[PDB]
């Protein structure tokens, strides 16, 4: 009853901070011209869903997987870049900046609301146990 | 065997 | 049990806000899942249910006794947003202070109780 | 399994190579 | 002792062979059993304090409340014991 | 089956 | 004695409580540490070994200048990793934090329940 | 086993200032240019290892060494300086500031953390001392 | 003379704890005095030589002045990192000690008055 | 065992 | 011995010498 | 035994 909020609000706390992960992934590599073969860096996505272990529908948030967007990548022209294809194209990455520093501050503002969730069923816990004494 | 328990 | 009747109503209700606060951090923690509903209980009418079975019957020592083994309404949504949750921040932290409150006040009932029935005893 | 579960046999190590 | 290898071989040829109820020696028995335990949660306490690796306060201070529940289960009995010994030695016969 | 959360699912793109 | 069996669940569980706060302390301590796997141990399943099978073989102590035993053991899991980091610290403190808080408060309830057995029975004895 | 965590987070409190005394003395002297004799100051950094040797596999961290980093130091050209070599290049700490910056925020917040696990388990056998009430 | 040899252990032990409490604060006290090393006990080695092991004059008269006849190794705490005022005084270890030390009077308070309660309690009838 | 916490061991390296 | 343990004899003086001689 | 507790202490001087 108030024993699963621990996991829920820990299942919480650790997919925002994959998606923070994430984010601050995608910022990084937002100039990145090629990983450790020949392929550009596709931006990652998490991927949230309701994690109910038992049946009763509702629970935590769980990262099922991340995944990499297929949105088309950005074309530049260098054609003495040796990764450049037939056409002298480059590809680039997509990441939206503005995208994934809002995602940042999001992940951070949600993460701070599940603190305190636990702060308050913490306090509310050990309370219980005085119970008529 | 891999991570055979 | 006589004293069961008479703490029936505390330990039910209490037992219900810890549920209720339980689904209302659930809907905390799936803020961003997209396409999530905003799930919660209507506290009284669930309280009358609980408030308002039959053991199998052990006929000898080996005979094995029974083994023992709420409804979920939709919270209507304020503002449409675009990946489909409908989870309010405000509406449900006030809601989640509330319901944190309810079940110290009901600590607070049952303990009182507990304890005076204690000192009636006490000599 | 799950990402936050118990095993009972160490992760292997993780190494980022330059270029593979 | 050489009488006491005597009675070694003694209770080996007793042995051999085979192949009284008196309440002081309960009360003895019950009297030493809560003097072990007493003593078991004190040599606990005693180690603890001088920095024995391997000890845990949470099993000293079980250990401590165990001798006293004992002590007090004996000092109930002894109390009840003494109280029917009084009633039965005061009647006027 | 909740999606990406936050910024790609909170912009308008036609449906596939 | 029926006075140690009645009272050894919660004695145990706080014990086991104790040491898996031990565990928990030493993967937060280091949470910096290189090539560090974060360790833990499954609690059901350890206390239920701890009552089947018995807190091994004493030896005889014939003479008393005979010595007694001495000393001589729970199983360390290692936890799935979350997500990768380059130095190789498969300690994740959100979980650490969560788990060393809801540890913490299951030790609180095994104490208060192993307080209210003795409590009673020292009321039962109050004459 | 409680007590042991005094210890446990005692090491962590000690290894974790250690870590960031080496921070600070590599933040501040980044633009030295000698040594007392005449050497150049090389960035030091600290080494962990676990206390697993009053344990079994279990411990705090402790410090082994403090290590001087190998990596080659910049140079920069200055042929009037007396420290210069044949080629008129002198020596210069290879300090990277962010990283310096970085070390000693994880310093402090692992500092922190250490805290509060010292002083929730220090209220847990206070409260344990009254067992039984 | 058994009421004392029983307690002995735990009062000796109790008053072996707030000397050294007595010596963290003072080394706590002077944390920042320039050339003052850090001191403290070893608790076991000093406890198992007190429960191992002056000449005040001889007041024959009824009427002079009783007089007076007026022990512990201090060790040296080893220095973690060095500081150029020379003051070996860790105050990261110096709190952890303290904490425990404070515990572990308290715990021994604990442990002596469950004993001269349970000695008390057998005599009440 | 352990190394260097933090910034050395947190970024590419060459192999060696 | 370790770093925070204890000894028997006092660390030495500490100095930081600007230029050595 | 002592001296000034603070910048005037644990600050590089030339030696006397």
């Keep these: 009853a108030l024993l699963n909020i621990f996991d829920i609000a820990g299942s919480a706390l650790a997919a925002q901070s994959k998606r923070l992960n ?34 009763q529908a509702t629970g935590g948030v769980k990262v099922a997987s991340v995944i990499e967007s297929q949105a088309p990548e950005k074309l ?58 | 065997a891999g991570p055979r328990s | 049990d006589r004293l ?18 339980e689904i209302l951090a659930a809907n905390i923690a799936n803020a961003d899942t997209p396409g999530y509903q905003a799930r919660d209980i209507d506290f009284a009418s669930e309280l009358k249910k ?17 083994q023992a083994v709420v409804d979920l309404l939709y919270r209507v949504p304020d503002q449409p947003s675009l990946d489909g949750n409908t989870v309010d921040m405000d509406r449900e932290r006030t809601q989640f202070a509330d319901n944190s409150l309810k079940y110290q006040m009901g600590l607070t009932v049952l303990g009182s109780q507990l304890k005076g029935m204690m000192n009636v005893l006490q000599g | 399994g799950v990402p936050g579960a118990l095993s009972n046999q160490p992760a292997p190590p993780n190494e980022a190579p330059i270029a593979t | 002792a050489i009488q006491g290898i ?27 059993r809560i003097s072990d335990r007493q003593a078991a949660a004190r ?51």
């Design chain 1, 22 to 55: 994430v984010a601050a992934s995608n910022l990084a590599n937002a100039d990145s011209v090629t990983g450790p073969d020949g392929q550009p860096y596709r931006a990652k996505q998490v991927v949230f869903q309701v994690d109910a272990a038992p049946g």
């Design chain 1, 76 to 133: 530049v022209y260098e054609p003495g870049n040796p990764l450049a294809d037939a056409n002298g194209y480059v590809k680039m990455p997509n990441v939206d900046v503005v995208g994934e520093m809002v995602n940042t501050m999001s992940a951070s503002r949600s993460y701070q609301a599940n603190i305190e969730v636990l702060n308050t069923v913490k306090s509310m816990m050990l309370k219980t146990l005085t119970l008529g004494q």
């Design chain 3, 4 to 21: 069961d009747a008479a703490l029936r109503f505390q330990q039910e209700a209490l037992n219900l806000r810890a549920q209720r606060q």
């Design chain 3, 50 to 66: 609980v408030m308002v079975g039959v053991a199998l019957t052990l006929t000898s020592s080996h005979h094995i006794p029974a």
């Design chain 5, 6 to 32: 005597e009675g070694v071989i003694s209770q080996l040829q007793a042995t051999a062979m085979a192949a009284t109820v008196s309440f002081a020696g309960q009360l003895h028995a019950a009297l030493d």
């Design chain 5, 43 to 93: 040599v606990q306490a005693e180690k603890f304090t001088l920095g024995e690796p391997g000890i845990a306060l949470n099993d000293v201070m079980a250990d401590m409340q165990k001798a006293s529940v004992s002590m007090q289960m004996g000092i109930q009995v002894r109390n009840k014991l003494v109280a029917a010994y009084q009633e039965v030695m005061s009647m006027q016969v």
